[PDB]
Write a protein that binds this ligand. Structure first.
Ligand SMILES: Nc1nc2c(ncn2[C@@H]2O[C@H](COP(=O)(O)OP(=O)(O)OP(=O)(O)O)[C@@H](O)[C@H]2O)c(=O)[nH]1
Ligand SMILES: Nc1nc2c(ncn2[C@@H]2O[C@H](COP(=O)(O)OP(=O)(O)O)[C@@H](O)[C@H]2O)c(=O)[nH]1
Ligand SMILES: Nc1nc2c(ncn2[C@@H]2O[C@H](COP(=O)(O)OP(=O)(O)O)[C@@H](O)[C@H]2O)c(=O)[nH]1
Ligand SMILES: [Mg+2]
Lengths: 66, 161, 22, 35, 426, 428, 426
């Protein structure tokens, strides 16, 4: 096994895999606040914002089809 | 959808039951480790609680399915001979898929599956029809209250319909 | 004046997240 | 200069970091909230 | 924004601050080259408090490495986490202070203060607003206390509404290297008592024996003393860089602790702390951790609080904990130790809840405590001062560089004022 | 139609609003992206294609509690312009929030409040959720409320305060800024519902069986309290109580308007199925001395007026039977100028439950809000506390530094000294 | 719940506590590592009386291991079931009392009792509410007799209302090791009689008599000897940790056995005790268990109870048994043995029922009894003290460390007044 049974005392067990430190597995995957402890469900934190398909002047989604 | 296929779900004395034998009951998974002191302390309370619920009534109300976080098959059977409720064989990858779905792991995390929040060992967690989480019994969590959070069960409002 | 990346709460960061990712 | 790895690890102070870490499950986090 | 400019005063503050930038780098998940990982973007989301963007994706500390001798500046850059500081941040003195207040505060302070104030001006004015400056220094040496507190005078007269937070070590009761201890400590207190907002003390002999009977470590070097102070270095500023339930600031720490502007000399402590054999056998919860933190056995300042009174206390808890057993325990320890606290203040102490613990722990505390038991050092260094001051000894090394008899009796009368203020408030 | 603009200041007000705006989303089902997968027009403003946006203005002079809700799960629900933030915290200090650091933020907060108060027809009240225990909550709360008094004069301005509880006090300067904020709470507020921490500490251990709750569990209770209060405006039912008549049946004199609160079916689901929550059971659990969420024994001081917000499936006649049960009881005393002393409201939809919370399903709840003379010793206990530090003037150099001419402590001394002096003058 | 703090005083105190915590551990299903095994609900419904969770899923005993010499517990930490203990609960000595009551109580016991008290209120106040203390020692040695009774007098001041029961082993007449026996005995009893709520007297030679005459053990070592004491150690706290038909707390015993507050010294026996040849021939019934209960060769104190009268008595039954076959055998020993019981107490005796038996045995009874026949031991130490004290022998080791002659004389007057108090209630 990977040495947990006899009260594993070092958290260097999670640093062999991020040996180049940039491999996108140690890049931003947890948030540890009490607001996520209390008020958070499946995926409604990491979602993009939809603005427009026409650019900065586009205040909404529209077109000549309407 | 189906959570447990035809040959995955076996109770005591090694008879496999399909998903059909589980409706009408409040179903929890129980992720536990054989050599773990938390699990060893919690197990008699779980046994007494399960016995009182499922003995004193007109229906079989609650039901527990074991998932091992242990090392080997002998440790499996030594743990397994102590529980009377359902279980999944360790070598079935269904255990690993449940481990990744309900986030109940044991600090082997970056080597395979490097996401975040952990919810460690042990964890009895009540589930539903499409495999969704219903409510967490807080043994080792933000409430961290052990051996009595089994009473935080809600059998009437969580049923396997 | 000091300018950091878009993942830091400094000045208008909500308008610095969607047009350029950093 | 007495180049022994235990002596340098002592003198830059790895020992208090090891003695100040906790040897069990210290990070616990489940979101209690349901949809 | 919310930035704090850091000052590495003296070589004593250089070794203390080198492990401070050790604990803040790996708390923020920082590569020594300057980059980042650590799977939790909350470390970047408040990174500006102690770091600056180096216009290449790199992060550099907002530290001012300063000394009058370059031997220890060689050792800091040669050591790990030494390449993080840009080379322009270091400022060098060549002749070296001779463990001498006159050699630092007057003579070669004139040729370096004009340099170090240029570096801190380009650092502090790079932002729209800031809180203040934290300083790690000593009161035993000449370049850690003389020209160290000389910078404190200049930074106050240009920033009169910015918080001063002076991590400082003191001379020891039982041991004294660098034989002229009281002439260095006293003459720096005379400026540290009004040009510094919040002074908070460390005794290296109290750190020698905390490593002895609570950590159980056989051969204590200084590097294990550095990291032990370094935990409480991070814990007092952790609520600025991290979110929390009771968010706290160093201005919160100021506004809530000091009753009267003269006396601000506080005590600093840390918990939990166990040996290797005792790590597994101890619980980890608030009502068990508070009994350790309210001890003289773990206090990094060796002023025994049992012969004193806590005018005010404060405990910045860290980690995801419930808060009812926090502050019901705050009144629990106050009711049990009723005479140990002052009587005209109901609910003496603050409780703060920070949400991110130090790495490798579920929870920890730092304990900022205003206590009148600290006066026992202020009479110990005063009657040891008057031992040499009466016999006129070891003082021709000072008068030749700008001393007079006036400021020495003024320095003695200053602690006679501060001690009398301490004992009259009991 | 109707709307009530909510204004939260201080980290306590922000975190309370994180639970109140949590619960309003699930009452009339509204997802965090605004969308629903005429009752929403009490706390939401429909704009565009189903984009329901709340009616709130977050306020804190530090960027820590409101930056955190920007990155949380309500980046899209809370539209990102009314989450007003500053940089330097007021640091538990009334002379900071009411003065030098804080005029920069009153100007922008009044702008967005004026935009939110003049975009829907017939605004109905201002629910302020302040925290008289510290800095930004009390200081910016006092300055902002003093500007709403002249900007909107005819206006109902319900408050929800976290007064310093007797034994629990997480900051030592709470006795100063609590007395200093009575000037903002005695002549600039219509409804002054009183809450404190240690009473909602006790309300969760003996009733919900959590021996270590958190401020989340506290703010869920406060969210239940204001949900029942504003349930009659939002929803429909027999014998509605409006905000317009809420203070009309609770405020006898213009100065005595400091009320209390108690909920009733606060039971976890285990010992909730084992008791039949009748109308008479919940109203006597409401009038229970231990169910007040304030340290106020309602037996050293006589009641003056009650406002019993029933909601759920309750018939309007057994309410009168249970009110008559309370009236005949000698442990619930009344004073002689009120042969009637109850105004009760009734809604129809059940008191909601949050999935993942400590409460259960009940279709009844009594959120009674009462104006009694027993609120007086809550203030008078702070009177003895305030004098013990003011005698030799510690923690004063900060106040005198950024404002606070010495004599504002003296006028706030006599303002709160005249406050409880009215109370035993009334009840004789 | 109702926690019992355990206190180990002396070399024999540390060894008898080693036997107690290793018969309580396997009674509760506790592994040598510290974990649990046994999957029975009754073993964990009440384990906080003697154990504490150490946030590792495990249980640490609430015991304090103390003497003045580090050569005692360095064998038990390497011993089996000995690593279970809290490692900083050991508070060592360095000099070691040379079988001296003078050294243990006054000279080196003063500077070490401050850490003894420091560790005990941590373990007592650290839970919700305390039941009391449990102290095992000798009154013939130097450490368990000198600083043991100093701890007894001290902890009574901070906990005046709590229960306190002490298992103390006494000197033997025919075998007197630790040659200065009566001086350690009499100067300890005279201050342990007004500071202890109830005391259990054990005697070494009666322990050997049980091993030879009853158990038929060829070679009784101290390990087996401590086991015989430790069986009745657990039987007194039987109804605390485990439920039963009739409950008996420590105060349940104290109230019913002490009619007058001065006398609380109790003879202890344990039943059944079968030899390895006679176990399969002996019926295990309640009537035969109550007569092994009442026997001079089963008393662990060598005071023949037929020489006096049974002032009060009580029996803690264990296991599943009928309550009437308890209750009738409680009567018929009173009516048959009319002369061996006191006349002015109707129903001289108490009975209680545990539902959970000890390991292996179907039923077992521990017996406690306040008989006035223990006076013969008190005159035995009276004339042994007086014979040495009329010659002033071995007093230079005592009076050379700060005690006047009058302290010995008031110890003689206090203990002989106890002798006359037992004689007037014959
Ligand atoms: N009910 C409840 N009270 C809280 C909460 N957070 C803080 N408080 C109370 O708020 C009071 C002080 O106000 P804070 O929110 O801490 O600070 P503030 O009002 O924002 O002003 P500053 O001191 O400048 O930060 C304390 O007495 C706390 O008890 C919370 O989440 N819920
Ligand atoms: N950081 C550090 N401080 C020390 C060490 N040894 C002693 N000290 C403390 O530092 C003081 C010596 O002054 P120092 O700052 O080192 O010399 P300076 O060059 O004259 O300022 C003494 O009073 C000691 O209390 C050490 O190894 N490291
Ligand atoms: N029951 C028991 N008694 C012992 C043991 N070892 C010593 N004793 C008794 O203790 C006496 C010796 O005193 P001791 O406790 O060693 O002195 P101390 O260590 O200074 O308290 C002798 O008379 C023995 O009868 C043991 O292992 N078990
Ligand atoms: Mg806050």
């Amino acid at each position: 096994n990977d040495r947990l049974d006899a009260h594993n005392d070092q958290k260097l067990t999670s640093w062999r895999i991020p040996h180049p430190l940039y491999t996108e597995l140690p890049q931003g995957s947890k948030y540890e606040t009490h607001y996520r402890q209390s008020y958070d469900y499946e995926d409604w934190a990491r979602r993009p914002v939809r603005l427009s398909k026409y650019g900065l002047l586009g205040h909404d989604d529209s077109g000549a089809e309407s | 959808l189906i959570l447990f296929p035809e040959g995955s779900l076996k109770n005591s004395n090694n008879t496999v039951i399909p998903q059909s034998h589980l409706k009408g009951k409040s179903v929890a998974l129980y992720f536990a480790d054989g050599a773990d002191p938390k699990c060893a302390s919690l197990l008699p309370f779980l046994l007494n609680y399960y016995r009182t619920m499922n003995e004193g009534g007109a229906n079989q109300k609650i039901e527990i399915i074991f998932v091992s976080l242990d090392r080997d098959r002998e440790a499996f059977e030594s743990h397994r001979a102590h529980m009377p409720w359902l279980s999944i064989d360790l070598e079935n990858p269904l255990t690993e898929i449940l481990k990744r779905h309900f986030r109940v792991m044991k600090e082997y995390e970056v080597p395979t599956y490097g996401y975040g929040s952990r919810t460690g060992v042990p964890s009895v967690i009540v589930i539903g029809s499409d495999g969704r989480e219903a409510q967490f019994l807080p043994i080792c969590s933000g409430l961290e209250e052990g051996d009595r959070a089994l009473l935080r069960w809600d059998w009437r409002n969580t049923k396997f319909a | 004046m000091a300018i950091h990346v878009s993942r830091t709460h400094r000045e208008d960061y909500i308008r610095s997240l969607t047009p350029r990712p950093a | 200069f007495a180049q022994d790895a235990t002596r340098q690890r002592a003198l830059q102070g790895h020992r208090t970091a090891d003695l100040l870490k906790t040897p069990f499950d210290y990070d616990l986090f489940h979101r209690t909230r349901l949809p | 924004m919310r930035e704090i400019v850091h000052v590495q005063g003296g070589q004593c503050g250089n070794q203390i601050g080198a492990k401070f930038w050790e604990v803040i780098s790996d708390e923020h998940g920082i590569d020594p080259t300057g980059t980042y990982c650590g799977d939790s973007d909350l470390q970047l989301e408040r990174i500006n408090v102690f770091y600056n963007e180096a216009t290449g994706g790199r992060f550099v500390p907002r530290a001012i490495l300063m000394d009058l001798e370059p031997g220890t500046m060689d050792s800091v850059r040669a050591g790990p986490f030494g390449q993080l500081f840009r080379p322009d941040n270091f400022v060098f003195g060549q002749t070296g202070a001779g463990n001498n207040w006159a050699k630092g505060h007057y003579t070669e302070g004139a040729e370096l203060i004009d340099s170090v104030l240029d570096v801190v001006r380009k650092e502090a004015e790079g932002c729209d607003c800031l809180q203040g400056f934290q300083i790690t220094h000593s009161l035993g040496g000449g370049t850690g206390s003389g020209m160290g507190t000389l910078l404190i005078s200049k930074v106050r007269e240009e920033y009169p509404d910015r918080i001063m937070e002076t991590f400082s070590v003191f001379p020891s009761p039982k041991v004294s290297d660098t034989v002229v201890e009281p002439y260095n400590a006293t003459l720096s207190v005379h400026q540290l008592v009004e040009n510094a907002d919040e002074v908070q003390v460390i005794d290296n002999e109290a750190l020698y024996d905390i490593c002895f009977r609570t950590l159980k470590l056989t051969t204590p070097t200084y590097g294990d003393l550095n990291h032990l102070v370094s935990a409480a270095m991070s814990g007092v500023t952790c609520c600025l860089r991290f979110p929390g339930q009771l968010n706290s600031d160093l201005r919160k720490l100021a506004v809530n602790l000091i009753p009267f502007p003269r006396l601000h000399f506080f005590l600093i402590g840390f918990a939990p702390l166990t040996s290797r054999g005792s790590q597994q056998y101890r619980a980890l919860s608030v009502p068990e951790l508070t009994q350790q933190m309210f001890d003289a056995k773990n206090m990094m300042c060796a002023s025994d609080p049992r012969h004193g009174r806590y005018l005010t206390a404060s405990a910045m808890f860290r980690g995801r904990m419930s808060t009812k057993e926090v502050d019901e325990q705050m009144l629990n320890v106050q009711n049990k130790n009723s005479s140990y606290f002052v009587e005209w203040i109901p609910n003496n102490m603050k409780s703060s809840v920070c949400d991110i613990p130090p790495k490798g722990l579920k929870m920890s505390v730092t304990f900022v405590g205003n206590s009148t038991a600290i006066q026992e050092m202020f009479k110990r260094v005063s009657d040891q001062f008057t031992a040499m001051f009466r016999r006129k000894a070891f003082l021709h090394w000072y008068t030749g560089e700008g001393m007079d008899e006036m400021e020495f009796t003024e320095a003695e009368s200053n602690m006679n004022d501060l001690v009398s203020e301490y004992q009259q408030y009991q | 139609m109707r709307e009530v603009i909510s204004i939260h200041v201080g980290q306590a007000g922000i975190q309370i609003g994180n639970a109140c705006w949590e619960l309003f989303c699930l009452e009339h089902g509204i997802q965090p992206d605004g969308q629903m997968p005429d009752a929403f027009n009490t706390f939401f403003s429909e704009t565009g294609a189903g984009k329901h946006v709340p009616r709130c203005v977050f306020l804190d002079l530090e960027p820590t509690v409101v930056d955190e809700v920007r990155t949380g799960t309500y980046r899209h629900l809370f539209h990102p312009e009314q989450l007003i933030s500053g940089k330097e915290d007021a640091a538990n200090n009334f002379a900071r929030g009411h003065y030098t650091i804080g005029k920069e933020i009153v100007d922008l907060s009044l702008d967005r409040i004026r935009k939110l108060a003049d975009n829907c027809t017939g605004l109905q009240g201002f629910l302020m959720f302040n925290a008289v225990g510290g800095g930004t909550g009390s200081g910016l709360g006092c300055l902002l409320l003093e500007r709403l008094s002249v900007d909107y004069g005819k206006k109902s301005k319900l408050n929800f305060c976290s007064w310093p509880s007797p034994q629990v006090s997480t900051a030592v300067v709470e006795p100063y800024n609590s007395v200093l904020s009575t000037h903002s709470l005695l002549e600039h507020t219509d409804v002054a519902v009183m809450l404190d921490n240690e009473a909602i500490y006790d309300i969760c251990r003996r009733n919900l069986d959590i021996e270590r709750p958190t401020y989340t569990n506290l703010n869920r209770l406060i969210a239940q309290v204001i949900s029942s209060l504003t349930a009659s405006l939002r929803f429909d039912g027999a014998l509605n109580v409006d905000v317009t008549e809420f203070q009309t049946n609770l405020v006898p004199y213009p100065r005595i308007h400091f009320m209390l609160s108690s909920y009733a079916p606060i039971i976890s689901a285990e010992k909730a199925y084992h008791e039949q929550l009748s109308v008479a059971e919940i109203t006597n659990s409401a009038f229970e001395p231990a169910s007040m969420m304030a340290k106020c024994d309602p037996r050293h001081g006589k009641y003056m007026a009650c406002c019993l917000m029933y909601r759920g499936d309750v018939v309007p006649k057994d309410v009168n039977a249970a009110v008559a049960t309370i009236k005949t009881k000698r442990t619930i005393q009344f004073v002689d100028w009120c042969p009637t002393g109850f105004k009760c409201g009734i809604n129809y939809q059940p008191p909601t439950v949050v999935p993942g919370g400590d409460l259960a399903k009940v279709m009844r709840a009594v959120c009674m809000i009462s104006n009694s003379t027993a609120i007086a010793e809550v203030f008078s206990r702070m009177d003895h506390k305030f004098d013990l530090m003011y005698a030799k003037r510690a923690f004063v150099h900060w106040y005198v530094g950024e404002g606070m001419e010495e004599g504002e402590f003296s006028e706030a001394r006599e303002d709160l000294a005249a406050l409880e002096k009215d109370y035993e003058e009334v009840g004789i």
